[PDB]
Design a protein around this nucleic acid. Structure first.
Ligand SMILES: [Mg+2]
Ligand SMILES: [Mg+2]
Lengths: 1097, 270
DNA sequence: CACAGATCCCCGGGTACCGAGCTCGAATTC
DNA sequence: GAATTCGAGCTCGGTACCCGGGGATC
C-alpha cells in the first residue's frame, strides 16, 4: 500500500444520515417538517439521471470528471502510463517535512534519503506538464538557516567550536517545557562561520556570524523563540521555500521549469505511484541542481478553475432563520460547481450537487445551450453527508488548481468545513493536493484586531475569492453579487432571497430545480467576473516578482513581498536582516512619524486654468535620488567624519535627529537598487506593450502593474512599527524630503514666474497663450506629491504642453535625476473645497471628483444623485458657473442680505425637486440605503452607538445573516414613530439587564430588507437634512468656505409650508372653518380668502 | 419703490415702538400675514393662539399690491423680522422699510433698518438687513365676527381676574355674567366678582352687550401663563358664545394691541 | 498571529459652559 | 401693601469643543 497514508475517504460504509423530512414523497403531512437524523449502514450514493453509483467509486463511469491517478491506494492509470517530463509549470510550492524512516519502503535514491535522514524539509513544486498531466516535484536538499553573532554566542554560551553551538541547540531542544522535539541530536544542525554585516547603520562593520542550518521549520521556530533569547537571531523567519527560491538564482514561485541533468549527472527520479505524496499524475524527486527556470515559455498550461457556490436551508421551527452551520438541522441543500479551463478560459463542466430530487427548468437549460455552455449534470443525494462527501470527492479527484466563488471565505468554505468537521467529523487534511496532513484551514478575522482579512489555505489549491478582488477593484456601496453584476457586467440578474428557500425546497423537484437555477447563475456570474479581472494573472505576476508563492501573495500582506525582495538583494550584498519582530511575535489614532503635509488650499471656485504638476513616484524617487536605506543611514556623525559634507552624504534633521545618508558612490542603497531595477524592468515592459499581440499584451499589462504595486509599498515597509525590518528613520526621511520638495517647488514657481516676462523668457510659446486679464502664477493647493498652480492670465488651450516644459524646467532646476515633476492635467474649472476635497473639470476631459462624498461609499443613492446633479450644474451649465463665479465678488455674509446672482435659479431647482422626491410615499427605498463597513469585531468598538452596529445586533437578534468583519452593512433611517420609540426603550431595558424627544440616528437605523417586509417609513427629516448637508459640505467653497452661511442659503431654496396641526385642523373644521390652501383648488382658496377677510371686516 | 412697500419713520415708528415693547421675545418666532389691511402677527403661546394686528393706518407709508403673503418671522431659524421692534435692540433707530418684490406666489421681503447717526442721516445696517421668501402655502385660522359680549377692564381688575384662575387641569376655571350684571370668575377655591356698567369704584367693569348673559368654563390651561407672558396691562375680555367650541379673546387696550384667543367647553345657551 | 505609511475632513455622540430669556421672590418704596 | 425695579435663581436651547469612526487622499 501507500508509503504515506491517504486521509481522505476512499471507502465509506457507515455515515450520519441527515436529510429533510419533506423529501420523502409518500410521507403524511405530519412527517414532513424536520430532519431525519441518524446513522445509516450503507455506502454513500449519488444519483445522476436514472443511474446510481457509490460516491467513493472510481471505476469507469462517473457522474463528475476526474483528474486523479490514484484513489485510495489503487492505481487507476492506463497500463504503461509513464509520460516523460521535461518541462512543467509550477503554480504552488508546498514545504513539508519528510523522514527517512517514514520513507524506508518508498525506494528513493540515496541522495534524497540523505537529505531527510532524521528529518528534512522537502519543497514540493506543484504543477502541470504542457500535456496537462498534474505533477509534483519534490526538491530535497533545501535547509533553513539563521545567523547569530559569533562573539555574542561565544561569550554567552562558551562555544569553542561550531559543533558546540550545534550541541547546545540540540540540548535546548531536548529540554523544552514540552516534549515536542524528542530524540533530536547535534547532527540535526550544521554551524559554519561566515562573515556578514547587519543591514542597518552604515558605520556597522562586517562581523563573524554562525549560520546554523536547521532541518525543520518547527525546530527553527522553537530555537528562534526560546534559544538564547538575549542573542539576536538574524533570519529565522525565512521559510524553506524562500531559501529555495533565493538560493537558486532565477527560480520563481510561479512559472515554467525544466528537469536538468544536474551536477554529476544526477537526474530527477520518478516516484512509484504508491510513494506519491500528492494527488498528481506523475511525481519526481530531485535536488535544486536538477531544476532550470525554462525561460521562453510564459503561458499557463490548462489549470482548472472551480467556481463553486453553496445553498443552505434552515431547519428548526423558524426556517426563516438564516442557516447556521453548527445546527445539524440547518444543512447544505445544493452546491453549484463550475469547472473552467484556465488557459482557454472555457467552461467545461456544470455540476449541481443537490440534496433531494432536482429538475432544472427548461428555460434555464435552453439558455445554457444557447450560450454554448455545457449541459448541467445534476447530482442527487439523499442526505447532506452524501452530498458534501461527493463534493469533497470531486475536489480531490478533479483537484482544481484554482478555486473561486463569491464570498467563499466568509460563508461557503466555513459552512462546508463546519459541517464536515463539527457534524460529520471528516478529516480534511488529505482533501487538498496532498494525500494527507495538508492544511485545509480557514481563518476568520474573529477577535484579531491585527488581521485585515479572512484567509483560506488549502494545500495546492489557490482560492481566489472574487469578493476580495471586487472589493479591491471597484468602489461600491454594496458588494452583493447582484449589485456587483449590475455594476461590473451590466447583467441585471434575478436574486433568490434565502427566506424563499424553505418554501421552494418543500414543493418538490421543480422548485428545487429553480433553486438550482439560481445557484448555477450565481456561479456563472462569478466565473464571468473572474475572467474579466483575471486575478490569477496579476497575483502570479506579483508572486513571480516578489519571490513568494501565490497563496502568500493573495493572503499574507504587503510586507513579505518587499521583505523577500530586500532579502534577495541584501544576501547578494553580504548583509543579513535581523529578526526583531521575532521578539515581538508575542505582541486616539497613533502615528509613528510625521507624514506629508497638505498646503493650505486657496479654497473656492477657480474658473481660470489650473495646472497640476505632480511628482512621478515621489517617495520611491526620493529613496533612489537620496540613496535612503537601512545600510546607508547613520544616526551618528562619527560615522561619516571621513567623508565630505556634500558629495559623500546628505544630512538632514528628520525628527530633530540629524540623520546622515551616504551617497550611492559611497554605498548604494538596497531599497534604491530594488526600486531602480524594478522601474527599469517596468519601463522595458511598458515599451513592449504596444508592439506585441493582444494576448501577450494582457500579461504584460499585468506584469508591469505588479511592478507598480511592488514599487509603492517600499516606503511604507520601512514605516511599519513592529514590522519585518522597520526603519522609521528612513520612512520619516522620505517624508521629510517630500515636504521640503513640495515647498521648494512652490517657492521656485513663485520666484521664477511671478511676472509674465520671466515666463516668456523661459518659454516663448507663452506669448501665444496670454489670456486677457492680469498674469499671476500662484499655487493654490498641494497634497503630498502635487501642486495646483492657478495660472491667471493664461489660456487653458496650450497649457498642459507648456506645463510639461515648466515641470521639466523645475525638475532640472531643483531635484536629482530620478525625481521628476510633470504636468498631466489642467483644470479649466476647479472647486477646491478642503484639504483633500476638490472637484474639477479637466481641460478637454472628464470631471475629477476627489473625496467629496460623491466618491464615498457611505451615502445613499438619492443624496449622491442629487449632489452630482448640482455639481454638473456648477461645472457644465454656463449660467450657473457664471453666477457661482460672481458669488466670489462679495464676502459671503452679504449674500444673506442680498438676492443670490441670477444664474443660480437652476441650482435651487434641483434641490427643491429633491425635496419633493423625498417625501413621495412611493419612494424607492433602495435609494435611501446608507451603508457602512463593520471594520472591527463589534466588541472591539469603543463607541458602540453606530448605526451599522445597531443594525448588526438587530440582524443577530433576528437570526438573519450576520455580517462578517469588513462587510458593508446597509441600513436605513426609519421615521421615529411611537412603536420605534418604545422598541428602542425596551431594547435598552433588555440590553442593560443582560449582563418630546429625538432618538439618535443609530437608534433609528434599520435593515432595509426588514424595513421593506414590514411597512416601516423612512426618516425624511434625516434624509433631507443630509441631502442639504452634503450640498453645504461641497458648495461651502462658493460662499467663502462658511458652512453656516451655505446652509442658510441652501435652505432658502426649499419651499416652506406652515399649517396648524391635523387634530386642531379637524376641530376648527368642526367649528366651521375651512381650507384656504392649495389642496382642493386655487380658485376656491381665493374665494374663501376673500370671504375670510371680508368676514374679518 | 417696491411693488409692495411698508415704511415707518417717527410719529408712526414710535407708535410701533410702543406696541412691541413688552411682548419681549415671544412673538419673535411668528407668522406675518401681510395684505392691504396691514400685518397680522400670529403666534401660539403654549398652544393658545395669539394675534397682533398692525394696520395699514399705523405705518408711515402702506402700499399693498398683490395677494396676501405670509412670511415666517424667523430668518434662517435664528434672526427675526420683529426683533427690529424689540424695546431696545437697535437704540437710536430711525426708519424701517419692508420691501416685498416679485411675483404673486414667490415674493421676498427685505427689511432694511436705519439708525439716526449722531447729527446724521443713516447708518443703514447692511450687516442687519434681513431677507425672507414667503411661505407659498399657508392656511392660517383667524378669529371671526363680532363678540357675543365684551368687558373692558383696567389693569388691576384684570390682574385680579387672571390671578383667580388655576393653571392646572385639576381645577377647571369658570367665567359667568349672570342677571343684573355681576360678572364673576371662580373655581373650587377662588372667586372674584365685579359690577358691569354700560357704555352706549375699583370693582367695576365697562362693557357692551352685557344683557347677553353667559356662563362658560375653561380647560386646557394656559391662560394666566400667556396673558402674563404677553405682559397684558388690562384689556377687554370678549366672549364668542355662538360656536360649537366657544372662544375667549383677551384683547389688550394697552400700549400694545395684542390679543390672545382661548377656547372653552361647549355651552348651552338659548 | 498577523501586519504599507500618515493626513485629513466630516459626522455622530458626548460633554460643558453660558448668554438669553424669564419668571419668581422679596428688599426698598409713589 | 401695589406696582416696581433690576436681583437672584431656574431652564433651555445655542454654540462650541472633544473624541471615535468612516473612509477618503497621497
Ligand atoms: Mg460563491
Ligand atoms: Mg451563496
Amino acid at each position: 500500500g501507500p508509503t504515506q497514508r491517504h486521509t481522505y475517504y476512499s471507502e465509506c460504509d457507515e455515515f450520519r444520515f441527515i436529510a429533510p423530512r419533506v423529501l420523502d414523497e409518500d410521507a403524511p403531512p405530519e412527517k414532513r417538517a424536520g430532519v431525519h437524523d441518524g446513522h445509516l449502514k450503507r455506502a454513500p450514493k449519488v444519483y445522476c439521471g436514472g443511474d446510481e453509483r457509490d460516491v467513493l467509486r472510481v471505476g469507469s463511469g462517473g457522474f463528475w470528471p476526474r483528474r486523479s491517478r490514484l484513489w485510495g491506494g489503487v492505481d487507476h492509470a492506463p497500463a504503461g502510463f509513464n509520460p516523460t517530463v521535461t518541462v512543467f509549470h509550477v503554480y504552488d510550492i508546498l514545504e513539508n517535512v519528510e523522514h527517512a524512516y517514514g520513507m524506508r519502503a518508498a525506494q528513493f535514491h540515496a541522495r534524497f534519503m540523505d537529505a531527510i535522514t532524521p528529518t528534512g524539509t522537502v519543497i514540493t513544486l506543484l504543477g502541470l506538464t504542457p500535456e496537462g498531466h498534474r505533477v509534483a516535484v519534490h526538491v530535497y536538499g533545501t535547509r533553513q538557516y539563521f545567523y547569530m553573532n559569533k562573539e555574542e554566542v561565544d561569550r554567552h554560551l562558551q562555544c569553542r567550536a561550531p559543533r558546540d553551538l550545534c550541541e547546545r541547540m540540540a540540548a535546548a531542544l531536548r529540554e523544552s517545557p514540552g516534549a515536542s522535539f524528542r530524540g533530536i541530536s547535534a547532527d540535526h544542525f550544521e554551524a559554519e562561520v561566515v562573515e556578514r554585516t547587519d543591514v542597518y547603520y552604515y558605520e556597522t562593520r562586517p562581523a563573524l556570524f554562525y549560520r546554523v542550518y536547521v532541518r525543520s521549520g518547527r525546530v527553527l521556530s522553537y530555537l528562534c523563540d526560546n534559544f538564547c533569547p538575549a542573542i539576536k537571531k538574524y533570519e529565522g523567519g525565512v521559510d524553506a521555500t524562500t531559501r529555495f527560491i533565493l538560493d537558486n538564482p532565477g527560480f520563481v514561485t510561479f512559472g515554467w521549469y525544466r528537469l536538468k541533468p544536474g551536477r554529476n549527472n544526477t537526474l530527477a527520479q520518478p516516484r512509484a505511484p504508491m510513494a506519491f505524496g500528492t494527488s498528481s499524475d506523475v511525481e519526481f524527486n530531485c535536488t535544486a541542481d536538477n531544476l532550470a527556470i525554462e525561460g521562453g515559455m510564459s503561458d499557463l498550461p490548462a489549470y482548472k478553475l472551480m467556481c463553486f457556490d453553496i445553498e443552505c436551508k434552515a431547519g428548526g421551527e423558524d426556517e426563516l432563520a438564516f442557516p447556521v452551520a453548527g445546527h445539524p438541522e440547518d444543512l447544505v441543500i445544493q452546491i453549484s460547481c463550475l469547472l473552467y479551463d484556465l488557459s482557454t478560459t472555457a467552461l467545461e463542466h456544470v455540476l449541481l450537487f443537490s440534496l433531494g430530487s432536482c429538475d432544472l427548468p427548461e428555460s434555464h437549460l435552453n439558455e445554457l445551450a444557447a450560450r454554448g455552455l455545457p449541459t448541467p449534470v445534476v447530482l442527487e443525494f439523499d442526505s447532506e453527508f452524501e452530498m458534501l462527501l461527493a463534493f469533497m470527492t470531486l475536489v480531490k479527484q478533479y483537484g482544481p488548481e484554482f478555486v473561486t466563488g463569491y464570498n467563499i471565505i466568509n460563508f461557503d468554505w466555513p459552512f462546508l468545513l463546519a459541517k464536515l468537521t463539527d457534524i460529520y467529523k471528516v478529516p480534511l487534511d488529505g482533501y487538498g493536493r496532498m494525500n494527507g496532513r495538508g492544511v485545509f484551514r480557514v481563518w476568520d478575522i474573529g477577535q484579531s484586531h491585527f488581521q485585515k482579512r479572512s484567509k483560506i489555505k488549502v494545500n495546492g489549491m489557490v482560492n481566489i475569492d472574487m469578493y476580495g478582488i471586487i472589493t479591491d477593484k471597484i468602489k461600491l456601496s454594496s458588494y452583493k453579487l447582484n449589485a456587483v453584476a449590475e455594476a461590473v457586467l451590466k447583467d441585471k440578474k434575478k436574486d433568490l432571497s434565502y427566506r424563499d428557500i424553505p418554501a421552494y425546497y418543500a414543493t418538490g423537484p421543480a422548485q428545487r430545480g429553480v433553486i438550482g437555477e439560481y445557484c448555477i447563475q450565481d456561479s456563472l456570474l462569478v466565473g464571468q467576473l473572474f475572467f474579466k479581472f483575471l486575478p490569477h494573472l496579476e497575483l502570479s505576476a506579483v508572486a513571480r516578482l516578489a519571490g513568494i508563492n501565490i497563496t502568500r501573495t493573495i493572503y499574507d500582506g504587503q510586507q513579505i513581498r518587499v521583505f523577500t525582495c530586500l532579502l534577495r538583494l541584501a544576501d547578494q550584498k553580504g548583509f543579513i536582516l535581523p529578526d526583531t519582530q521575532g521578539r515581538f511575535r508575542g505582541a486616539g489614532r497613533h502615528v509613528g512619524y510625521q507624514g506629508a503635509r497638505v498646503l493650505d488650499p486657496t479654497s473656492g471656485f477657480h474658473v481660470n486654468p489650473v495646472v497640476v504638476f505632480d511628482f512621478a513616484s515621489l517617495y520611491p524617487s526620493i529613496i533612489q535620488a537620496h540613496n535612503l536605506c537601512f545600510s546607508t543611514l547613520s544616526l551618528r556623525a562619527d560615522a561619516v567624519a571621513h567623508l565630505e559634507a556634500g558629495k559623500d552624504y546628505l544630512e538632514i534633521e528628520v525628527g530633530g535627529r540629524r540623520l546622515f545618508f551616504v551617497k550611492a558612490h559611497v554605498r548604494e542603497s538596497l531599497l534604491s537598487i530594488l526600486l531602480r531595477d524594478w522601474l527599469a524592468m517596468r519601463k522595458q515592459i511598458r515599451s513592449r506593450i504596444p508592439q506585441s499581440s493582444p494576448e501577450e499584451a494582457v500579461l504584460l499589462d499585468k506584469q508591469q502593474a505588479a511592478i507598480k504595486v511592488v514599487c509603492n509599498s517600499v516606503y511604507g515597509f520601512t514605516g511599519v512599527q513592529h514590522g519585518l525590518l522597520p526603519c522609521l528613520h528612513v520612512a520619516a526621511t522620505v517624508t521629510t524630503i517630500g515636504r521640503e520638495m513640495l515647498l521648494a517647488t512652490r517657492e521656485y514657481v513663485h520666484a521664477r514666474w511671478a511676472a509674465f516676462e520671466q515666463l516668456l523668457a523661459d518659454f516663448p510659446e507663452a506669448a501665444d497663450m496670454r489670456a486677457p486679464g492680469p498674469y499671476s502664477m500662484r499655487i493654490i493647493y498641494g497634497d503630498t506629491d502635487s501642486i495646483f498652480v492657478l495660472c491667471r492670465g493664461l489660456t487653458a488651450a496650450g497649457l498642459t504642453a507648456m506645463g510639461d516644459k515648466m515641470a521639466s524646467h523645475i525638475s532640472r532646476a531643483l531635484f536629482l535625476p530620478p525625481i521628476k515633476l510633470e504636468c498631466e492635467k489642467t483644470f479649466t474649472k476647479l472647486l477646491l473645497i478642503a484639504k483633500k476635497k476638490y472637484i474639477g473639470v479637466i481641460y478637454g476631459g472628464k470631471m475629477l471628483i476627489k473625496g467629496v462624498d460623491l466618491v464615498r461609499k457611505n451615502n445613499c443613492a438619492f443624496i449622491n444623485r442629487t449632489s452630482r446633479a448640482l455639481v454638473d450644474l456648477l461645472f457644465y451649465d454656463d449660467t450657473v458657473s457664471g453666477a457661482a463665479a460672481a458669488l466670489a465678488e462679495r464676502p459671503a455674509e452679504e449674500w444673506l442680505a442680498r438676492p443670490l446672482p441670477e444664474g443660480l435659479q437652476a441650482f435651487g431647482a434641483v434641490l427643491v425637486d429633491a425635496h419633493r422626491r423625498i417625501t413621495d410615499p412611493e419612494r424607492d427605498i433602495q435609494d435611501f440605503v446608507l451603508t457602512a463597513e463593520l471594520s472591527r469585531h463589534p466588541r472591539a468598538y469603543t463607541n458602540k452607538r453606530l448605526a451599522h452596529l445597531t443594525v448588526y445586533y438587530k440582524l443577530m437578534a433576528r437570526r438573519a445573516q450576520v455580517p462578517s468583519i469588513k462587510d458593508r452593512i446597509p441600513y436605513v433611517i426609519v421615521a421615529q414613530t411611537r412603536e420605534v420609540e418604545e422598541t428602542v426603550a425596551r431594547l435598552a431595558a433588555l440590553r442593560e439587564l443582560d449582563a418630546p424627544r429625538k432618538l439618535l440616528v443609530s437608534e433609528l437605523a434599520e435593515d432595509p430588507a426588514y424595513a421593506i417586509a414590514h411597512g416601516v417609513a423612512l426618516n425624511t427629516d434625516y434624509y433631507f437634512s443630509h441631502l442639504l448637508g452634503a450640498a453645504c459640505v461641497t458648495f461651502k467653497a462658493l460662499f467663502g468656505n462658511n458652512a453656516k452661511i451655505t446652509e442658510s442659503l441652501l435652505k432658502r431654496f426649499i419651499p416652506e409650508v406652515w399649517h396648524p396641526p391635523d387634530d386642531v385642523a379637524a376641530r376648527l373644521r368642526a367649528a366651521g372653518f375651512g381650507a384656504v390652501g392649495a389642496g382642493a383648488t386655487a380658485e376656491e382658496t381665493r374665494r374663501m380668502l376673500h370671504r375670510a377677510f371680508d368676514t374679518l371686516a | 419703490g417696491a411693488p409692495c412697500q411698508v415704511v415707518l419713520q417717527g410719529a408712526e415708528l414710535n407708535g410701533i415702538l410702543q406696541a412691541f415693547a413688552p411682548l419681549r421675545t415671544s412673538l419673535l418666532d411668528s407668522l406675518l400675514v401681510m395684505g392691504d389691511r396691514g400685518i397680522l402677527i400670529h403666534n401660539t403661546i403654549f398652544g393658545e393662539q395669539v394675534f397682533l394686528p398692525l394696520e395699514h393706518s399705523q405705518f408711515s407709508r402702506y402700499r399693498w399690491r398683490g395677494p396676501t403673503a405670509a412670511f415666517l418671522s424667523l430668518v434662517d431659524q435664528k434672526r427675526s423680522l420683529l426683533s427690529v421692534f424689540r424695546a431696545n435692540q437697535y437704540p437710536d433707530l430711525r426708519r424701517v422699510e419692508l420691501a416685498i418684490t416679485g411675483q404673486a406666489p414667490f415674493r421676498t421681503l427685505v427689511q432694511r433698518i436705519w439708525t439716526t447717526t449722531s447729527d446724521g442721516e443713516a447708518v443703514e445696517l447692511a450687516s442687519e438687513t434681513l431677507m425672507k421668501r414667503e411661505l407659498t402655502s399657508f392656511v392660517v385660522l383667524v378669529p371671526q365676527g363680532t363678540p357675543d359680549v365684551q368687558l373692558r377692564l383696567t389693569r388691576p381688575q384684570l390682574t385680579k381676574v387672571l390671578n383667580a384662575t388655576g393653571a392646572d387641569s385639576a381645577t377647571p376655571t369658570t367665567f359667568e355674567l349672570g342677571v343684573n350684571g355681576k360678572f364673576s370668575v371662580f373655581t373650587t377655591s377662588t372667586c372674584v366678582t365685579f359690577a358691569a356698567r354700560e357704555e352706549g369704584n375699583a370693582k367695576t367693569v365697562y362693557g357692551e352687550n352685557t344683557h347677553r348673559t353667559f356662563s362658560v368654563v375653561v380647560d386646557d390651561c394656559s391662560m394666566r401663563a400667556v396673558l402674563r407672558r404677553l405682559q397684558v396691562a388690562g384689556g377687554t375680555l370678549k366672549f364668542f358664545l355662538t360656536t360649537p367650541v366657544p372662544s375667549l379673546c383677551v384683547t389688550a387696550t394697552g400700549p400694545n394691541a395684542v390679543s390672545a384667543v382661548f377656547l372653552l367647553k361647549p355651552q348651552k345657551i338659548c
